[PDB]
mmCIF file of C-alpha atoms and ligand atoms in Angstrom:
data_model
loop_
_atom_site.group_PDB
_atom_site.id
_atom_site.type_symbol
_atom_site.label_atom_id
_atom_site.label_comp_id
_atom_site.label_asym_id
_atom_site.label_seq_id
_atom_site.Cartn_x
_atom_site.Cartn_y
_atom_site.Cartn_z
ATOM 1 C CA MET S 1 -15.119 15.251 -22.588
ATOM 2 C CA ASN S 2 -13.447 12.129 -21.367
ATOM 3 C CA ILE S 3 -11.464 10.526 -18.520
ATOM 4 C CA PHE S 4 -8.163 11.614 -19.574
ATOM 5 C CA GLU S 5 -9.412 15.355 -20.134
ATOM 6 C CA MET S 6 -11.642 15.297 -16.818
ATOM 7 C CA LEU S 7 -8.628 13.971 -14.820
ATOM 8 C CA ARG S 8 -6.432 16.456 -16.195
ATOM 9 C CA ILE S 9 -8.785 19.258 -14.924
ATOM 10 C CA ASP S 10 -9.007 17.822 -11.528
ATOM 11 C CA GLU S 11 -5.324 16.872 -10.952
ATOM 12 C CA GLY S 12 -3.438 19.688 -12.922
ATOM 13 C CA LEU S 13 -0.291 19.289 -14.461
ATOM 14 C CA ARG S 14 3.085 20.114 -12.990
ATOM 15 C CA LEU S 15 6.778 19.415 -14.204
ATOM 16 C CA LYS S 16 8.440 19.616 -10.700
ATOM 17 C CA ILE S 17 8.017 17.436 -7.609
ATOM 18 C CA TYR S 18 5.587 18.888 -5.518
ATOM 19 C CA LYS S 19 3.011 18.248 -2.396
ATOM 20 C CA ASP S 20 -0.280 17.072 -2.851
ATOM 21 C CA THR S 21 -3.215 17.934 -0.653
ATOM 22 C CA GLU S 22 -2.318 15.349 1.565
ATOM 23 C CA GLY S 23 1.474 16.814 1.849
ATOM 24 C CA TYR S 24 2.560 13.904 -0.104
ATOM 25 C CA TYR S 25 5.337 14.083 -2.929
ATOM 26 C CA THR S 26 3.811 13.724 -6.410
ATOM 27 C CA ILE S 27 4.550 15.022 -10.062
ATOM 28 C CA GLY S 28 3.025 15.368 -13.397
ATOM 29 C CA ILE S 29 -0.771 14.805 -13.276
ATOM 30 C CA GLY S 30 -1.524 13.465 -9.894
ATOM 31 C CA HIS S 31 1.349 10.943 -10.106
ATOM 32 C CA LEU S 32 1.924 9.873 -6.469
ATOM 33 C CA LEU S 33 5.502 9.263 -5.859
ATOM 34 C CA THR S 34 5.693 8.363 -2.057
ATOM 35 C CA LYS S 35 4.196 8.972 1.404
ATOM 36 C CA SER S 36 7.536 9.324 2.618
ATOM 37 C CA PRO S 37 8.356 12.604 4.026
ATOM 38 C CA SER S 38 11.655 12.375 2.505
ATOM 39 C CA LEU S 39 12.362 14.404 -0.635
ATOM 40 C CA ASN S 40 15.189 12.048 -1.621
ATOM 41 C CA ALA S 41 13.099 9.151 -1.315
ATOM 42 C CA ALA S 42 10.824 11.027 -3.893
ATOM 43 C CA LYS S 43 13.326 11.689 -6.247
ATOM 44 C CA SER S 44 14.461 8.118 -6.088
ATOM 45 C CA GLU S 45 11.007 6.983 -6.804
ATOM 46 C CA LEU S 46 11.115 9.287 -9.646
ATOM 47 C CA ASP S 47 14.223 8.507 -11.421
ATOM 48 C CA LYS S 48 13.289 4.780 -11.218
ATOM 49 C CA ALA S 49 9.676 5.616 -12.705
ATOM 50 C CA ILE S 50 11.146 7.645 -15.601
ATOM 51 C CA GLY S 51 14.185 5.794 -16.373
ATOM 52 C CA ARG S 52 16.578 8.494 -15.897
ATOM 53 C CA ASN S 53 18.341 10.771 -13.563
ATOM 54 C CA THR S 54 15.767 13.713 -13.414
ATOM 55 C CA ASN S 55 16.853 15.661 -10.641
ATOM 56 C CA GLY S 56 12.974 16.351 -9.799
ATOM 57 C CA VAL S 57 12.092 17.778 -13.245
ATOM 58 C CA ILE S 58 10.248 16.116 -15.952
ATOM 59 C CA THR S 59 9.236 16.864 -19.387
ATOM 60 C CA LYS S 60 5.532 17.082 -20.465
ATOM 61 C CA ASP S 61 5.886 13.975 -22.616
ATOM 62 C CA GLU S 62 7.284 12.416 -19.707
ATOM 63 C CA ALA S 63 4.318 13.306 -17.480
ATOM 64 C CA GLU S 64 1.869 12.418 -20.078
ATOM 65 C CA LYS S 65 3.456 8.826 -20.212
ATOM 66 C CA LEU S 66 3.131 8.641 -16.378
ATOM 67 C CA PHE S 67 -0.691 9.468 -17.000
ATOM 68 C CA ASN S 68 -1.063 6.926 -19.371
ATOM 69 C CA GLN S 69 0.110 4.201 -17.260
ATOM 70 C CA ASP S 70 -1.727 5.547 -14.289
ATOM 71 C CA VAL S 71 -5.300 5.708 -16.067
ATOM 72 C CA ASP S 72 -4.629 2.127 -17.455
ATOM 73 C CA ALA S 73 -3.767 0.785 -14.261
ATOM 74 C CA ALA S 74 -6.710 2.287 -12.630
ATOM 75 C CA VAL S 75 -9.106 0.547 -15.115
ATOM 76 C CA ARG S 76 -7.583 -2.590 -14.705
ATOM 77 C CA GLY S 77 -7.443 -2.117 -10.845
ATOM 78 C CA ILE S 78 -10.981 -1.740 -11.202
ATOM 79 C CA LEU S 79 -11.843 -4.877 -13.237
ATOM 80 C CA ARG S 80 -9.600 -6.869 -10.925
ATOM 81 C CA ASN S 81 -11.469 -6.033 -8.090
ATOM 82 C CA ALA S 82 -14.661 -8.031 -6.878
ATOM 83 C CA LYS S 83 -16.579 -5.428 -5.159
ATOM 84 C CA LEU S 84 -15.726 -2.802 -8.155
ATOM 85 C CA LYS S 85 -16.128 -4.515 -11.334
ATOM 86 C CA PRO S 86 -19.772 -5.246 -10.742
ATOM 87 C CA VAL S 87 -20.387 -1.509 -10.316
ATOM 88 C CA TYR S 88 -18.321 -0.522 -13.284
ATOM 89 C CA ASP S 89 -20.194 -3.142 -15.401
ATOM 90 C CA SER S 90 -23.548 -1.770 -14.464
ATOM 91 C CA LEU S 91 -22.762 1.803 -15.385
ATOM 92 C CA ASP S 92 -23.018 4.161 -18.444
ATOM 93 C CA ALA S 93 -20.063 5.319 -19.985
ATOM 94 C CA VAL S 94 -20.059 8.704 -18.257
ATOM 95 C CA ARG S 95 -20.725 7.399 -14.800
ATOM 96 C CA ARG S 96 -17.750 4.940 -15.499
ATOM 97 C CA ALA S 97 -15.447 7.830 -15.793
ATOM 98 C CA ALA S 98 -16.716 9.110 -12.413
ATOM 99 C CA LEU S 99 -15.723 5.863 -10.864
ATOM 100 C CA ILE S 100 -12.448 5.866 -12.334
ATOM 101 C CA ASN S 101 -11.685 9.110 -11.163
ATOM 102 C CA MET S 102 -12.211 8.236 -7.536
ATOM 103 C CA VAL S 103 -10.100 5.142 -8.118
ATOM 104 C CA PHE S 104 -7.186 7.323 -9.616
ATOM 105 C CA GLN S 105 -7.264 9.621 -6.642
ATOM 106 C CA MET S 106 -7.930 7.321 -3.813
ATOM 107 C CA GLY S 107 -7.127 3.756 -4.894
ATOM 108 C CA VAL S 108 -9.123 0.749 -5.342
ATOM 109 C CA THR S 109 -8.962 -0.439 -1.866
ATOM 110 C CA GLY S 110 -10.411 3.178 -0.755
ATOM 111 C CA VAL S 111 -13.052 3.160 -3.386
ATOM 112 C CA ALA S 112 -13.915 -0.507 -2.736
ATOM 113 C CA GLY S 113 -14.608 0.886 0.973
ATOM 114 C CA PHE S 114 -17.697 2.820 0.106
ATOM 115 C CA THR S 115 -19.745 -0.148 0.382
ATOM 116 C CA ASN S 116 -23.256 1.696 0.815
ATOM 117 C CA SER S 117 -22.669 4.225 -2.029
ATOM 118 C CA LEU S 118 -21.326 1.428 -4.140
ATOM 119 C CA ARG S 119 -24.846 -0.501 -3.690
ATOM 120 C CA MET S 120 -26.581 2.507 -4.379
ATOM 121 C CA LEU S 121 -24.766 3.263 -7.724
ATOM 122 C CA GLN S 122 -25.490 -0.298 -8.471
ATOM 123 C CA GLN S 123 -29.188 0.357 -8.007
ATOM 124 C CA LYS S 124 -29.131 3.359 -10.051
ATOM 125 C CA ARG S 125 -30.445 5.071 -7.116
ATOM 126 C CA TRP S 126 -28.750 8.367 -8.069
ATOM 127 C CA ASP S 127 -29.752 11.095 -5.484
ATOM 128 C CA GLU S 128 -29.506 8.605 -2.687
ATOM 129 C CA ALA S 129 -26.157 7.831 -3.669
ATOM 130 C CA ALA S 130 -24.714 11.373 -4.103
ATOM 131 C CA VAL S 131 -26.024 12.080 -0.688
ATOM 132 C CA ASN S 132 -24.279 9.162 0.742
ATOM 133 C CA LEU S 133 -21.084 9.733 -1.101
ATOM 134 C CA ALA S 134 -21.108 13.167 0.527
ATOM 135 C CA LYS S 135 -20.787 11.731 4.100
ATOM 136 C CA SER S 136 -17.010 11.144 3.750
ATOM 137 C CA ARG S 137 -13.781 12.572 4.524
ATOM 138 C CA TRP S 138 -13.052 12.605 0.864
ATOM 139 C CA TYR S 139 -15.870 15.245 0.365
ATOM 140 C CA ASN S 140 -14.941 16.947 3.360
ATOM 141 C CA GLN S 141 -11.150 17.217 2.495
ATOM 142 C CA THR S 142 -11.534 18.129 -1.257
ATOM 143 C CA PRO S 143 -14.916 19.355 -1.720
ATOM 144 C CA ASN S 144 -14.618 21.033 -4.946
ATOM 145 C CA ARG S 145 -13.326 18.031 -6.602
ATOM 146 C CA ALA S 146 -15.644 15.627 -4.780
ATOM 147 C CA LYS S 147 -18.749 17.862 -5.835
ATOM 148 C CA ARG S 148 -17.720 17.478 -9.494
ATOM 149 C CA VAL S 149 -17.494 13.795 -9.400
ATOM 150 C CA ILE S 150 -20.667 13.345 -7.278
ATOM 151 C CA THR S 151 -22.668 15.491 -9.634
ATOM 152 C CA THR S 152 -21.235 13.197 -12.377
ATOM 153 C CA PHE S 153 -22.789 10.222 -10.626
ATOM 154 C CA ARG S 154 -25.797 11.989 -10.124
ATOM 155 C CA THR S 155 -26.398 13.534 -13.758
ATOM 156 C CA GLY S 156 -24.858 10.855 -15.889
ATOM 157 C CA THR S 157 -23.742 13.969 -17.866
ATOM 158 C CA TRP S 158 -20.553 16.374 -17.975
ATOM 159 C CA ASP S 159 -21.964 19.570 -16.865
ATOM 160 C CA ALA S 160 -19.792 19.689 -13.690
ATOM 161 C CA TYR S 161 -16.775 19.968 -16.031
ATOM 162 C CA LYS S 162 -18.916 22.072 -18.159
HETATM 163 CL CL1 CL Q 201 -11.266 20.125 -3.953
#
């Protein structure tokens, strides 16, 4: 298991524009295109991202390229953030992946927001963190996924993704 596989499971793969759990326009492997409710806005962001006139549809390869860019950006985002880097540096590899997953879904800013949990993570207080992390909209809105990530922080293993 690795971050790529992990995330491919949590986000799925879709080759035509679609709406995420928040009703936003996305494609590929959780690649967010726009929060604009406008589908043409979406198609516009898409062609721009791909480098061609897609007409809302992309190939596998294409999606994979997006994904690669997106994991990369998420790591880097993490390392460039003053609240997050330290956390990341204190964790083990599996747990690092868990952190990366959260940033890929909700962004730096959003994860940087979980102050208390970050601290707990930093202290390696796993059960405490798990609980605290569960007290969030994230958990309430996307429970199966959040449960998987949380368990990952809690156990430091991949069992949730079996
Ligand atoms: Cl879910």
